[PDB]
Amino acid sequence: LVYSEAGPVALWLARVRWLVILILTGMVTSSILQGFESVLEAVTALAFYVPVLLGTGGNTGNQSATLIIRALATRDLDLRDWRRVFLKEMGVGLLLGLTLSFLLVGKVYWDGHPLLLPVVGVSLVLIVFFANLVGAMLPFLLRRLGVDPALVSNPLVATLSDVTGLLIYLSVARLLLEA
């Protein structure tokens, strides 16, 4: 409604539902991390890079979403184009992944964690790649469902990327460090 004419309790009632849904979805991350407690306890430094990994996926996805939302609005793209966009973006995400990975591997090299060099390097590439597709396709899904991306797309991409990003990161870590 109108912010100028809404009270604190009113704003709370208007915002709480969507935040409760998101956190209930976000709680899964804590379950995912606990399931990988063996690798986490063995190599403490794995925890150090969780925000950057997931945060970079969130940036990448939401950057992708903003582009697709704009194109659909201006009728530069139609709903039927989601497959063509999917095929092109998977090429864009790979390039973005390899680029950003190079920088983060350098950071890990600086911090002095040689075992995490391939772990963080591989994972970020996959994270940026998958976060990019999710960000690219989500506006197509919301337009089809009749939902407006404005207050929905950004946190959805971020929460989905956190969950997917953790699953990728921790699996790579397990495979390379515990196997």
Next chain:
Amino acid sequence: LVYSEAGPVALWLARVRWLVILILTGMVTSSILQGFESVLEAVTALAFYVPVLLGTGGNTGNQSATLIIRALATRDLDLRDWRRVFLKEMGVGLLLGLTLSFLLVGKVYWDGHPLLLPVVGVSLVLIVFFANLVGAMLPFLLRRLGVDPALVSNPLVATLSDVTGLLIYLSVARLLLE
């Protein structure tokens, strides 16, 4: 920049610079966590709640920002109305913080870390409270600086919430676990 006529390489060049800046800025969080390696070592379960703590903050901040950006764009609010918003959002942020904290506390108890009930519980309240303020004020700071908030708020709020969110969580953890 027309998307339908732009190739993969073209899209790549037009996107990297902003993503490169964001990850370089984001690297701060990595150093922050290393500075609190002591508590991370002491309690492993401390790391289990980092993404949900920072994620909830980012969502909270993006929400309040999106509301303010809309109010300023539709002339529902003036730039000079920042103080009124700030005072109102203190109440909204507290209520939101208390509500979400109650839920996350249940999850910590579900996960089986009663040790982490107070630290995670208090932290989310503080995180939501401050993330909501950052979100509500950033459009005001941006427009006053000659930059429309709708273009750059979302990456900014997420990064600020991650950095400040970590600092709150880990400092609370340090005080109560050490």
